[PDB]
Amino acid sequence: KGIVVEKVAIEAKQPNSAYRKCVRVQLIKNGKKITAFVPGDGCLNFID
Amino acid sequence: GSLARAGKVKNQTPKVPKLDKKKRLTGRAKKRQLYNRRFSDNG
Amino acid sequence: PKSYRNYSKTARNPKRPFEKERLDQELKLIGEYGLKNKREIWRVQYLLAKIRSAARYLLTLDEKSSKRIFQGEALLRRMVRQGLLGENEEKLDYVLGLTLPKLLERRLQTKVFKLGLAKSVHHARVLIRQRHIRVGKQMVDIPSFLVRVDSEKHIDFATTSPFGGARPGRVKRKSLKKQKEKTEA
Amino acid sequence: HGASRYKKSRAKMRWKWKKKRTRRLQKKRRKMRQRSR
RNA sequence: AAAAACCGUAAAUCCUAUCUUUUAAAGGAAGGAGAAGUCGUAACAAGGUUUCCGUAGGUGAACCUGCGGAAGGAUCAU
RNA sequence: CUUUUGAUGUUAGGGUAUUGGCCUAACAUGGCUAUGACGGGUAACGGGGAAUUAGAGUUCGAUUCCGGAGAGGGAGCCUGAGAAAUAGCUACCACAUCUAAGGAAGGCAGCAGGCGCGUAAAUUACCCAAUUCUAAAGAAGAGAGGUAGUGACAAGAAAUAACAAUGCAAUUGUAAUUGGAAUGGUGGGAAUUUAAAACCUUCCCAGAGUAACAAUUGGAGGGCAAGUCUGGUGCCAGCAGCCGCGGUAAUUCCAGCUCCAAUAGCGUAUAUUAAAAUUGUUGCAGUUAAAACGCUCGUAGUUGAAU
Ligand SMILES: [Mg+2]
Ligand SMILES: [Mg+2]
Ligand SMILES: [Mg+2]
Ligand SMILES: [Mg+2]
Ligand SMILES: [Mg+2]
Ligand SMILES: [Mg+2]
Ligand SMILES: [Mg+2]
Ligand SMILES: [Mg+2]
Ligand SMILES: [Mg+2]
Ligand SMILES: [Mg+2]
Ligand SMILES: [Mg+2]
Ligand SMILES: [Mg+2]
Ligand SMILES: [Mg+2]
Ligand SMILES: [Mg+2]
Ligand SMILES: [Mg+2]
Ligand SMILES: [Mg+2]
Ligand SMILES: [Mg+2]
Ligand SMILES: [Mg+2]
Ligand SMILES: [Mg+2]
Numbered sequence: 026k027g028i029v030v031e032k033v034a035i036e037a038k039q040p041n042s043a044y045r046k047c048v049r050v051q052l053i054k055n056g057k058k059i060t061a062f063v064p065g066d067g068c069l070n071f072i073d
Numbered sequence: 074g075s076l077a078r079a080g081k082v083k084n085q086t087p088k089v090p091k092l093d094k095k096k097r098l099t100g101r102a103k104k105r106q107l108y109n110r111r112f113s114d115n116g
Numbered sequence: 117p118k119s120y121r122n123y124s125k126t127a128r129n130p131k132r133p134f135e136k137e138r139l140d141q142e143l144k145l146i147g148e149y150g151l152k153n154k155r156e157i158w159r160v161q162y163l164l165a166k167i168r169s170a171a172r173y174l175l176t177l178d179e180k181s182s183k184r185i186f187q188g189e190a191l192l193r194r195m196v197r198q199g200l201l202g203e204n205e206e207k208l209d210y211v212l213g214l215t216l217p218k219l220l221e222r223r224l225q226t227k228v229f230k231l232g233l234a235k236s237v238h239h240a241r242v243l244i245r246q247r248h249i250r251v252g253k254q255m256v257d258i259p260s261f262l263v264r265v266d267s268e269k270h271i272d273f274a275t276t277s278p279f280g281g282a283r284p285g286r287v288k289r290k291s292l293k294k295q296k297e298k299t300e301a
Numbered sequence: 302h303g304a305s306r307y308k309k310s311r312a313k314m315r316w317k318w319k320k321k322r323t324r325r326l327q328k329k330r331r332k333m334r335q336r337s338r
Numbered sequence: 339a340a341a342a343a344c345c346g347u348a349a350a351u352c353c354u355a356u357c358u359u360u361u362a363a364a365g366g367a368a369g370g371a372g373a374a375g376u377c378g379u380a381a382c383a384a385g386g387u388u389u390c391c392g393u394a395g396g397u398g399a400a401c402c403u404g405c406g407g408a409a410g411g412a413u414c415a416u
Numbered sequence: 417c418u419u420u421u422g423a424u425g426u427u428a429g430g431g432u433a434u435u436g437g438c439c440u441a442a443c444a445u446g447g448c449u450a451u452g453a454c455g456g457g458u459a460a461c462g463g464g465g466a467a468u469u470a471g472a473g474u475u476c477g478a479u480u481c482c483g484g485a486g487a488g489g490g491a492g493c494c495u496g497a498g499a500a501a502u503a504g505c506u507a508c509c510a511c512a513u514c515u516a517a518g519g520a521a522g523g524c525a526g527c528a529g530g531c532g533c534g535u536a537a538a539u540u541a542c543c544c545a546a547u548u549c550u551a552a553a554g555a556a557g558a559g560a561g562g563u564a565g566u567g568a569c570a571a572g573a574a575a576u577a578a579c580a581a582u583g584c585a586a587u588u589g590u591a592a593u594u595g596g597a598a599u600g601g602u603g604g605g606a607a608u609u610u611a612a613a614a615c616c617u618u619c620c621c622a623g624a625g626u627a628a629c630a631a632u633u634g635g636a637g638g639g640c641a642a643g644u645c646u647g648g649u650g651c652c653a654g655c656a657g658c659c660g661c662g663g664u665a666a667u668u669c670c671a672g673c674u675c676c677a678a679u680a681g682c683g684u685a686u687a688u689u690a691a692a693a694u695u696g697u698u699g700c701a702g703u704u705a706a707a708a709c710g711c712u713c714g715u716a717g718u719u720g721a722a723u
Contacts, residue, residue, distance in 0.1 A: 034076050109590090112143075246598060349507075
């Protein structure tokens with residue numbers, strides 16, 4: 026479990042072309058920061 | 074950047090309601106129907 | 117503490133989920149004996165595999181050995197009592213020739229269908245589930261009941277069933293009611 | 302990376318010159334670590 | 339009975355000495371990924387000076403030159 | 417490595433329930449080790465056992481039984497046949513309660529229950545009727561133990577129709593229409609069960625037709641069973657474990673229809689076993705794919721003609 030810190034977009038690898046939607050999270054357990062993918066067509070605007 | 078395009082096509086597609094009832098068989102009767110359709114009428 | 121009663125499984129999965137020939141053969145068998153899932157086929161396969169494993173292990177063992185004599189006589193008696201071997205093939209080598217249709221022929225459903233007494237195998241399954249069938253003065257309502265040799269001549273309708281000499285059901289009595297008040301007024 | 306060093310089937314930079322570059326770098330590192338001791 | 343002394347069994351606190359784990363930082367210097375960047379053309383053909391090994395010097399860069407070795411050579415041969 | 421401060425032995429005593437460097441005095445220089453001592457790590461309590469495997473193996477075991485250890489952390493002690501006991505006592509370290517401020521009381525890793533921690537776990541219920549234990553031993557007591565409540569951890573059985581007639585492509589079959597039987601699920605009342613608690617079983621009454629008493633979760637290019645069907649989007653939005661799809665013809669995105677798989681169950685994440693003869697004793701490879709030490713001698717080890 027973690028608290029959302031930022032929303033970002035990531036490039037795809039070379040032969041493909043798209044902008045993938047992710048969030049940056051700070052973990053409650055130990056305070057570390059990770060990056061996580063948000064699956065779904067428009068699921069990013071479910072997140073504040 | 075441009076992350077305001079999220080959920081474009083999902084909001085673009087026009088909505089359509091589904092069909093009415095067409096209830097289906099469940100369990101042993103369904104297997105009976107499959108057996109009859111796949112084997113009985115073929116010879 | 118934890119309870120001392122135990123439990124075990126009865127089936128197994130095919131390890132290869134989309135093989136065409138196995139799937140067609142299973143549908144053959146299901147439609148022939150009127151079953152519900154692949155689980156019934158798999159449980160019969162499990163039982164047969166255990167039997168065959170015991171037979172193989174005994175057959176490797178020395179002829180005229182004590183363990184062979186005791187366990188082989190026990191297993192052959194069990195098989196002949198179940199109705200799977202016969203009379204002239206009790207030799208511990210005819211056990212390895214037992215197929216799936218052999219065992220799957222002893223279910224109460226197949227027996228009730230084959231002994232007249234029901235128009236179809238599906239009709240047979242429906243009647244068993246509605247408390248219409250006895251096996252020797254004991255009423256049974258489970259279609260996977262496997263019938264033994266000395267019990268196949270006592271299959272019959274139940275004494276508490278409208279098909280075996282009792283009062284009629286909830287529909288006949290209501291029709292007779294309504295007819296009575298129609299004809300008395 | 303033993304005898305398979307200097308193996309050339311792909312058009313890379315020559316092995317002994319890369320060896321020389323690494324040795325120069327290591328000499329610099331050793332001098333700068335000694336200066337703090 | 340209270341109370342003292344001594345040899346023992348000894349919680350605890352402090353001062354030093356090592357050790358293990360985690361961690362801050364001016365500055366220095368590697369690797370991986372990306373973008374249409376600037377400079378040359380070292381390798382692949384005898385790649386236009388055949389390539390490569392150990393060692394030692396030098397130069398913006400890839401690299402060049404001396405000494406000894408190999409063919410995985412461009413020679414199975416006078 | 418151990419040995420000034422007991423490390424290895426001998427002599428004499430002390431002490432204990434008894435043997436003993438267990439302790440004290442005198443004496444001697446011993447003891448262990450590449451067949452791994454002395455150290456470090458363990459997200460290590462040990463077994464009986466568990467999972468998966470043709471045979472070998474690999475990985476788990478806090479947790480029903482047995483053995484060990486502990487009661488916030490250490491040390492000391494009384495009673496007693498049995499304790500270094502903690503719902504016994506005495507101090508120190510930490511934490512914390514009541515107060516008239518002089519003082520007095522504390523230990524849920526026992527059963528329930530609360531906070532915190534986190535991905536992660538139930539009722540502040542009834543009873544001594546059964547199994548057993550203690551006593552001044554029928555008769556008292558027991559959160560030992562049993563009974564129920566919550567509970568898709570795991571395991572077993574098993575509904576969601578069946579039949580006939582008439583039509584209809586081929587005796588079938590059923591995208592259909594008719595019409596009567598058979599049944600539980602459900603509501604009420606009993607016989608029972610039980611410390612006249614509730615399940616389960618068995619009877620009586622009522623009670624199915626869109627039997628609305630209406631099955632889901634994932635998929636349809638290949639691996640891998642199943643659509644060259646319609647509408648929208650246009651390297652965007654998105655999908656995809658892997659190869660890949662997406663610029664007007666998208667079998668892969670978003671929807672509708674239809675099909676496929678398993679089915680009261682079905683997906684996702686992490687770990688582990690087979691697959692792996694990709695750890696090889698059975699049973700791998702070493703010219704060029706990863707890999708014969710530059711060469712010889714040599715101790716330990718492994719292996720050695722016939723009678
Ligand atoms: Mg090689
Ligand atoms: Mg050249
Ligand atoms: Mg002494
Ligand atoms: Mg254990
Ligand atoms: Mg125990
Ligand atoms: Mg505690
Ligand atoms: Mg104590
Ligand atoms: Mg205490
Ligand atoms: Mg307590
Ligand atoms: Mg508790
Ligand atoms: Mg749970
Ligand atoms: Mg009692
Ligand atoms: Mg008395
Ligand atoms: Mg689709
Ligand atoms: Mg494995
Ligand atoms: Mg293996
Ligand atoms: Mg194998
Ligand atoms: Mg190999
Ligand atoms: Mg050599």
